[PDB]
Design a protein around this nucleic acid. Structure first.
Ligand SMILES: [Mg+2]
Length: 117
RNA sequence: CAAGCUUGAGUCUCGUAGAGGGGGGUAGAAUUCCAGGUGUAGCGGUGAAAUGCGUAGAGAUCUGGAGGAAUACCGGUGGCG
């Protein structure tokens, strides 16, 4: 319906899940898919493979604009940091730049207590 | 008890290092919140879940603003009291 050809893959990779969002340079959301909503729950949801099909499913709800180049923004420590990026590149995508944007406070907010499991 | 003596103890001069104390300014990261743009069905959480949150449009992304609290890297059997 419209045209971009130049995008950015923001991947949010937490421990429990990994959300993939495709966007233009402006930061406007073009398409998105998550692992948790691609048929993966709990123990399987938090896997690199689930992040992979997330990246794959996302490349199908965006090529309506015919993106052809993009940059990658890796946020968080979970799986699908890396495997998500791979799936994008195999789905027919030229990777321009890779950047980690995981936030690091300069020691500000006190985090939750340690879990005594 | 009286006179002393200069090594103990002080005083003087010029410098050095320091998270030593008290007051006042100020900074950039992040969280949460408020207001919007893009976007759409999930997010969140766990060993597994559910409670919880989201079509009154969340989460994700970009933008502007409010507020509080603490000061990554430096950073170290480093330093000061
Ligand atoms: Mg802020």
């Amino acid at each position: 319906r419209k045209q971009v050809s130049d995008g950015v893959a923001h991947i949010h990779a937490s421990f429990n899940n990994t959300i993939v969002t495709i966007t233009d340079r402006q930061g406007n959301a073009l398409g998105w898919a998550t692992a948790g909503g691609s048929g993966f729950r709990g123990s399987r949801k938090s896997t690199p493979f689930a992040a992979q099909v997330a990246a794959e499913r996302c490349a199908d709800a965006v090529k309506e604009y015919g993106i052809k180049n993009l940059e990658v923004m890796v946020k968080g420590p979970g799986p699908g940091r890396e495997s998500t990026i791979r799936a994008l590149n195999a789905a027919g995508f030229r990777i321009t730049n890779i950047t980690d944007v995981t936030p690091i406070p300069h020691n500000g907010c006190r985090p939750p207590k340690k879990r005594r499991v």
